[model samples]
Target: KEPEQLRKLFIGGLSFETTDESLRSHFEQWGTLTDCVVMRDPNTKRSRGFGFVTYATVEEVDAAMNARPHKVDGRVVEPKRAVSLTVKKIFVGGIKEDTEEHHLRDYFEQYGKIEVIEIMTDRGSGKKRGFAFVTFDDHDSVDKIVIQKYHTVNGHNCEVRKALS
Candidate 1:
């Protein structure tokens, strides 16, 4: 069976000089644009070198996707369908600084099967940043964890919720 088409695309490799209008203009040629946005840093207000473009129809998405080697502002840009992940992933926060990835997995694994786990850390000190991301093999694990509200780990009450991603 064929899958339903999606109209959104993730456009990357943008120039720092790119603007919303420029992005819209480049992609408008391929389809009727519903929306176009270039990501920027809030503090510096500079382009983050990427943007998202949404068309009015999936046919436009396919046209843009099949069209080779997109270029904007004299530089080639990467384009791909902005498909969302269906896997159940959760964000675990409010962790103790000394918590380890294995320690987190050991506790959560009993709730359900975990496919991947990562504990965030400080880049300079290489210490745990009191937060982590854990992906479970099924939705049941996430539901079970969320229902529990909070979990005790390394002497700190950790938070378990759906990941914003």
Candidate 2:
């Protein structure tokens, strides 16, 4: 049993100076490109030092891999095949005392279906190491929610993002 698609890529360690166009030019040399995105911060929209690239087909994917040791914008970036997750794992940080589980759920619900059972945060023995894992039901939900990075949940700033796993 084999799959026909292996055209997706995760380009790692970019120079932050790189953009969609520059990334396109370099990888575009290998084959037909479908998705080329340099993941950016939702607040400042700064390059988050990483990106994802998708080729039109597996032939192009292999070509790009064999043609590896990617150097974009003066830094060597790592290119690897994209792995499929059951759904998508999103991590939200920078939460605090006032951030409630329902409060978090309520805000994100505007995007799509989610559950608070997986949203784990703790005040462990007096240390509130605020963080959360919001499991969204679809890629559509994941993408839309991350567009605006900093979310004001309970009037406190919380950062919503995709886990790079």
Candidate 3:
């Protein structure tokens, strides 16, 4: 039989104490749930600290995505949009440690107008993580940038890849 399709989300940072039942109860308020799964270890049958949830409709997915401070088991949760991959966003890695947002914007602006540029950073040290997510105004910009993916910038051989949607 063909599998049913639905709008899904990846819910991360779930507490080990979280259960499928609790996960369902928590997200149910957002919309009708098609499925709720708190990933578990095979041998111990314990929560693997994350899971996926599928909503009945696209509106439900939007509601959940816009909701503030998602929580489960009294711990704040991170909800990431789960959809088929696309190329509107590009992942740039191996950025030099000294590179800043403006520097990145200056380099990439030649390709097209950028919507957003986020440089991932270390939480504790507050240092650049040597990678970034660059969103473009349109898919065409991504196509243009991908051609120069392996090019170097500021003495760094930056690696560029398609960001997963």
Query: What is the TM-score (0 to 1) of candidate 3?
Result: 0.51
Taking all chains together, each candidate's TM-score versus the true structure is 0.48, 0.48, 0.51
- Write candidate 1's Cα lDDT for 53-78 as tens digits: 98988668667765648889888997
Model 2 per-residue lDDT tens digits across residues 36-113 = 999999999999989988887766876776666778889999776665432455788877655667877888887667
The lDDT, on a scale of 0 to 1, for candidate 1 is: 0.79
Listed per candidate, the RMSD to the true structure in angstroms reads 13.0, 14.2, 11.7
Off-target runs (Cα >4 Å) in candidate 2 are 1-5, 85-165
Better of 1 and 3 by TM-score: 3
Clashes of 3: 0
> What is the lDDT for 93 in model 3?
88
Each model's lDDT comes to: 0.79, 0.73, 0.79
Error of 1 at 126 (Å): 52
Tell me the lDDT of model 3 at 5: 38
Per-residue lDDT of 146 in model 2: 61
* TM-score, ranked from best to worst: 3, 2, 1
